[PDB]
Point group: C3
Chain length 283, copies 3
């Protein structure tokens, strides 16, 4: 098995730099149905994962898996087109290697979107949540993404996550929403990581409310932890597909079809917002 170590990440970065002359300082990972911005990257290069030395094998799951480099708003970026999720069975080492390759390529800021369920009673379908902290049930339970030997070249044995979600990036995101008069859609909140792939049950939703969670989803926290470990700043935004607490009270259900319809409804606005965030990131 391929470890997410310094030598293996260096070999992948070497291949990438040879194929493209882009030196990116921003990385992006987009949620399901929320990837249209990647198709609008300028002067771009598309690199299938399967072609990159030491990238994880993704043919069992199938579907798209490419690294895309180019320019947005005059800024140099790298995007993952086809996110890796831990409910698919990928190991800690497979999730971590692409983020550590980003670090070696020069990435200093990582922007992430996801689809999530609403727990807080003020959250409605179609709302956005700026993530300010998390509750990591896999990590408490011996499935943290950093379980294994520490790769000292990237970061410390025992990371502190108290500043994992950069405050100034949350402030910039909100400012742009206010300039475009959609701030009434924008909240902040704590994200619960449900390993998945089943949606949280009605009684799990009720438990998460008691525990101070605002939203629940099946992604994001592994990549945030690998980024924080190696000194990359993070902004993470959830798009709310439903309120799981209301659905429990009324005996109705979420499904993946309903999730994807909400994604389609907010895709173009999210694309515009993130384009402007990228343009406005401090120098």
């Amino acid at each position: 098995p391929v470890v997410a170590n310094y030598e293996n990440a260096s070999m992948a970065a070497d291949y990438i730099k040879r194929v493209s002359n882009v030196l990116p300082d921003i990385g992006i990972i987009c949620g399901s149905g929320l990837g249209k911005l990647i198709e609008e990257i300028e002067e771009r290069k598309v690199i299938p994962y399967i072609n990159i030395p030491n990238f994880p094998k993704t043919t069992v799951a199938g579907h798209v898996g490419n690294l895309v480099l180019g320019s947005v708003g005059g800024r140099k970026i790298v995007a993952m087109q086809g996110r890796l999720h831990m409910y698919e069975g990928y190991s800690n080492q497979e999730i971590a290697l692409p983020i550590r390759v980003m670090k070696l390529l020069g990435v200093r800021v990582l922007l992430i979107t996801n689809l999530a369920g609403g727990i807080n009673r003020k959250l409605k379908s179609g709302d956005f949540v700026l993530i300010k902290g998390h509750i990591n049930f896999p990590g408490l339970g011996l499935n943290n993404v950093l379980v294994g030997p520490n790769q000292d070249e990237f970061g410390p044995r025992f990371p502190d996550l108290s500043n994992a979600y950069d405050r100034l990036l949350q402030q910039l995101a909100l400012k742009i929403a206010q300039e475009n008069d959609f701030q009434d859609l924008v909240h902040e909140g704590v994200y619960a990581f449900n390993g998945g792939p089943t949606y949280e049950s009605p009684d799990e939703s009720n438990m998460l409310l008691k525990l101070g969670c605002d939203v629940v989803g099946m992604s994001t926290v592994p990549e945030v932890i690998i980024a924080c470990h190696c000194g990359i700043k993070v902004l993470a935004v959830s798009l709310i597909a439903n309120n799981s607490i209301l659905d429990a009270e009324n005996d109705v259900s979420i499904n993946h079809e309903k999730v994807l319809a909400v994604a389609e409804k907010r895709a173009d606005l999210l694309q515009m917002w993130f384009k402007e965030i990228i343009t406005r990131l401090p120098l």
Copy 2:
């Protein structure tokens, strides 16, 4: 390792159909000490797991492991004699394959019993609990039974569990208890899945009370999830061995000997109840 896929499940079903001419539409999985009904199946065929292509290897744990097919109350059934538990070290694929074989054989309803600890203060040793929902600590923590590639022939990538415990089956079970005047023993409640094999500690019991759990046990939820994923209806009933909250307050303990004595005390009544449930299942 043998994946719980369509081809592997089909090969096991083929062997079973050749050895027996029973086309079952009901499946049963019985808790420890609660298996006497299996010995009373009519015109029956006993098939050791070890003889069935692609069934999981169970010789390290030892003890009984047979699939039993025959008739109860004029209805065609298949039973697992010797349940597989995840605390023994079985993988997701090993737990799932027997349930997916049931699906291919024709099973539409799965009836399950277990032994559990009482958390809700109205529960006493010897009571029965109709399970109406669950809190899946392994699933929140990246050990859900569906972690891995999705087997699309059986079900969707992201299942909804809100109707995993069929309401009409709970109603039929209660009606039969009322007809036989043992309804004062019958409650409903939320089941917490403790991966095990240690009993939950006194402080874990107190935590589960705060979180809205009514009972706690080490089985059932993996099989419920595999069944729900592939469209099989479920009734699950816990037999209460003790009240863990009272034991914590009084500084006394449960053990496996005490559990088995409670099983013996309620075995014959549970056998009669489930015989009638099977007979009365809607056509």
Copy 3:
């Protein structure tokens, strides 16, 4: 892979008994920075793990790994110099084998120290907590140290943990603190096991307060469970590095450097305390 079974543990014990003539009835496992007592064991023998048949391989992590046998206060002891932690990726079998070797060598009492974060509001940096119970998030979530086949020669399939932390040993520890006038530093409390290696996040700290936890750490509970399973009595003491709830309210952070500085501040007192505990253990 080497299973923590009776034959494999017996082969390791044989080697140890040949190299040393010490028959220990006390075992010790010391927290990071808290190992000075081991360097003061009398008439001692140091045995590198790498030399002992069937001991787990520890070269990937590196750092010290020795078993040390000798006398303290006239009592015969065995110490682990270099603790194994589950966040390093060691399996259940690797953690359990050294404790089962202790059992075969004659150990009846196991004394443990660790470094932990404070959750209860009465806990300050530099305080000691006598552990009276635990909340085992890995165990609830299918990562209990006993997941796997049961090794029947050592203990039962389903252990009861209600008396895992011996009450009389807690009383002796407190009595010695009172004799030396440092009882104002000594509390009792419930320990939450965070699998690690990230420190619990600010929002995880707030959750643990709601759930009745007094301290949080990344060790101890696996060894306690293996010891309880095979009938070894346990005293476990946490040294508090910080109050995570105050740090969350004030937006400040713990780190490993700060932890180690607290260890240095209390090391000599902890060494004196444990020397006297060992001397005073009942015959």
